[PDB]
Amino acid sequence: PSNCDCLNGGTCVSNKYFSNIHWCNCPKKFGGQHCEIDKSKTCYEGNGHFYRGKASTDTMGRPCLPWNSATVLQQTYHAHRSDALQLGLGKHNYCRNPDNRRRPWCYVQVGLKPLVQECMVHDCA
Amino acid sequence: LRCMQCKTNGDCRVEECALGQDLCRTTIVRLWEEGEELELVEKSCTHSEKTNRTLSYRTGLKITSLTEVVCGLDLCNQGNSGVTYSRSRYLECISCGSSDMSCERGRHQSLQCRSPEEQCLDVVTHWIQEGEEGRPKDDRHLRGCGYLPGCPGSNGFHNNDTFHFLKCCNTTKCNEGPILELENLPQNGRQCYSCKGNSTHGCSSEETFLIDCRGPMNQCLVATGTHEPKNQSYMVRGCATASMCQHAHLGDAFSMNHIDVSCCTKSGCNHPD
Amino acid sequence: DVVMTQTPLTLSVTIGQPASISCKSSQSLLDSDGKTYLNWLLQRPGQSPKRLIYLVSKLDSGVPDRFTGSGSGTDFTLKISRVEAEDLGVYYCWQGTHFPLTFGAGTKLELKRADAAPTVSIFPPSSEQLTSGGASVVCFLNNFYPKDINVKWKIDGSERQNGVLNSWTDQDSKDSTYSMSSTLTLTKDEYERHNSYTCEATHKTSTSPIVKSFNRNE
Amino acid sequence: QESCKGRCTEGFNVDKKCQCDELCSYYQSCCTDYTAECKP
Amino acid sequence: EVQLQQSGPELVKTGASVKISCKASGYSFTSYYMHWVKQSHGKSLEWIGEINPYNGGASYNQKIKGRATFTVDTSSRTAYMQFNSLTSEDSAVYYCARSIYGHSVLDYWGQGTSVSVSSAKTTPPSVYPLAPGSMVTLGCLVKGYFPEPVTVTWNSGSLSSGVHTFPAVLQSDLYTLSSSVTVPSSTWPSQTVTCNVAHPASSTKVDKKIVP
Ligand SMILES: *[C@@H]1O[C@H](CO)[C@@H](O[C@@H]2O[C@H](CO)[C@@H](O)[C@H](O)[C@H]2NC(C)=O)[C@H](O)[C@H]1NC(C)=O
Ligand SMILES: *[C@@H]1O[C@H](CO)[C@@H](O)[C@H](O)[C@H]1NC(C)=O
């Protein structure tokens, strides 16, 4: 038996007196509506398929347009998808990696057209 | 007649506001823990019966502001809702929940309302065991600041398998004290009929049986309309209060569409007849 | 105590035929709840009575539409188009709208059918009744419609109206035609006073009265 | 004069621009400096 | 299945007292108001009362004269009627039913109740094997017995359809009745015929073979 979307022991809890809408009561180490992201990790696991978690940034230092953003939803992975939660993509501009690249990353507005740019983050080397 | 449709993530697209609901409702949840803090959108269409509502609950060091709003005007919900939104601090109340078993363990805390008409309430939800997955995820109990529909005063419903309830009032600290357990309540003296399920085999002349109503619900109630994911031909039976008869506050809780309630004075007026 | 008065009190119907009874109440029959309990309950013979209607319309589970309930106020109406053999039985209307409850009369129902001949036997008193001293001869008439029949005992050419115990039978479910059992209840001394007991009566299927007899040595 | 730096707790006070209590933000009533002074 | 089953029949010395059960399965018993109906004159119909398992109410019809006692057992899923000082008019059929709840107005009934009272104490009968001296019929004469009840069946009730009995006759303080069934001229005296007849008033059973 399974339900709602919530993760990591995150116990979904909804309510009657409004639209039976659902939101997850997460454990500390987690946060983001569905508990899709962890505010802890300094560094990421090799290839960082995985490091969700904040630190929106790049090697040169600029932002990470939030996947939630317009100029992403034109783009390749962005957060209205089917799979979203499974990518880490919430309303947040923090970095991610669902392409299996070098390291994690973000979409860095530069010039005009949004780009990929290697995101700043440490590794566990 | 039309409206807007936004997910929680908020894909922002539209609907015809279907038909049976003329109402565009915007729906919002506000979570706050320690300094940091968090929030949520659902814009969709909702049945006529619905009215605006707040209810902020406190689980301990984290607090939950729920709330919802309606307009029927073709196309309201995009953009905002309705420089500090909580201007001031209005009437005091106690709040706690069964999220952590907060209302259950004596942890009741002081939580100021985020607005002046927002009041004190004990609101109560029990289930038997399992309706669907182990049943809806609403707290077995909740208490704190809000405004629920037709809340002024008290209301709710009950019978063998299900207990819903609502308390509220404009007095400081009014909800405080113990936890409404039902079995705690008194004997209203009414004799009634309880049942769940389809024309038959859910509700039929068999499973039906006489139950003693407890508390302020001396009214014998019954209801119908479509239910969760479109299995219609569905009804409910049990003692309750005036509340559930006028409008439906039943229609919010049990989650059903364009239902109709009726009720009967002397006990046992309950039967399918 | 309200009055429950039904009409017609006497009604036979023919199959596929209309049946409308009508019930009446002294005052209204409408409780402070704004509903009306007036009802229809039938007793189908040789069984136990059962609820046909309640609420002046609303029909019980295994009840077919052929019935239709009606009326309001001091007056009421019951209706059936297709009348059948089930409907053979007794017909009662009662209101649960005052204590004490009230019961209509008992309007009784038949099904009119064709004519047929009563199949007759007549018997000797068993020895065993002749040991104790009583002597009783039967005249059966079995399954005859209509139910109009007139019993006659005739002794050795000299007729007798004395000591005649009859009993009817209810229009049955099946044949729809009635049954009859006459009995002639009498002494020992007497019985040996005669020989040829000729028995006869009247139905509508033969202008000529059908008869049967026997005698004292046979 | 908001400047919550005072005592950072007596408890919240209905006469003021901004109350320095833990609760403020939750009404977004927090004073510019709170997190600064209090919660160090 | 809604199930109502009363006591069977009872004889009673006038002015004295009787106790007649009512049974049920087919619901949560506690869940319905029970009745009783006088069917008197084999015809006229009259309300006895109501009573109601949970709250324990009891109705008595004004005219009752409270000769009547409803009553219950919860463990038994059973209604009673204790019904003291008795009479000639009394004698009738007594049924019971459900409301329910409150609101009078019944639905399902039980078979009924066989109840009558008089002076002359139980008299078992003598039966007279009436038989002759293309089809054929069988005379069975129950006579001299009193009081009720009494019934009969053929060859241990084998023969059913088209078989005919007549209503216990009565006079001079005894019942005398008539019973018959028909069969082919090929059907007898082939396989011997016993009408079976019984008398609860007297507690004894009997078998009468047809005797051509
Ligand atoms: C109607 O009530 C019945 C329960 O008696 C439900 O129908 C059965 O439901 C199960 C699904 O779990 C099916 O596998 C069976 O085939 C159904 N049986 C029959 C006889 O139809 C059903 O949940 C209810 N339907 C509605 C509209 O609520
Ligand atoms: C408080 O309750 C009193 C009861 O007398 C009532 O007058 C008033 O409407 C309530 N105040 C508010 C605004 O809730």
Author numbering:
A (entry chain A): 8 to 132
B (entry chain U): 1 to 82, 85 to 275
C (entry chain L): 1 to 27, 27A, 27B, 27C, 27D, 27E, 28 to 213
D (entry chain B): 2 to 41
E (entry chain H): 1 to 52, 52A, 53 to 82, 82A, 82B, 82C, 83 to 100, 100A, ...
Paper text:
The urokinase plasminogen activator (uPA) system, comprised of uPA, a specific cell surface receptor for uPA (uPAR), and serpin inhibitors of uPA such as plasminogen activator inhibitor-1 (PAI-1), plays a central role in many of these activities. Recently, we identified and developed a novel uPAR targeted monoclonal antibody that demonstrates robust antitumor effects in a number of different animal tumor models but does not block the binding of uPA to uPAR. In addition, we determined the crystal structures of the ATN-658 Fab fragment alone and in complex with uPAR, the amino terminal (uPAR binding domain) of uPA (ATF), and the somatomedin B domain (SMB) of vitronectin.
The presence of the SMB was absolutely necessary to obtain the protein crystals. Despite the limited resolution of 4.5 Å, the ATN-658-uPAR-ATF-SMB quaternary complex has high quality. The inherent glycans of uPAR at amino acid residue 52, 172, and 200 were clearly visible in the 2Fo-Fc electron density map. ATF binds in the central pocket of the receptor comprised of all of three domains. The SMB binds to the outer side of the DI β sheet, and also to part of the DII domain. The ATN-658 Fab binds to the DIII of uPAR, consistent with the epitope mapping results. The epitope on uPAR for ATN-658 is close to the C-terminus, and has no overlap with the urokinase and vitronectin binding sites. Among these three segments, the C-terminal segment of uPAR has direct interaction to CDR H3 loop of ATN-658 and appears to be the most important epitope for antibody recognition.
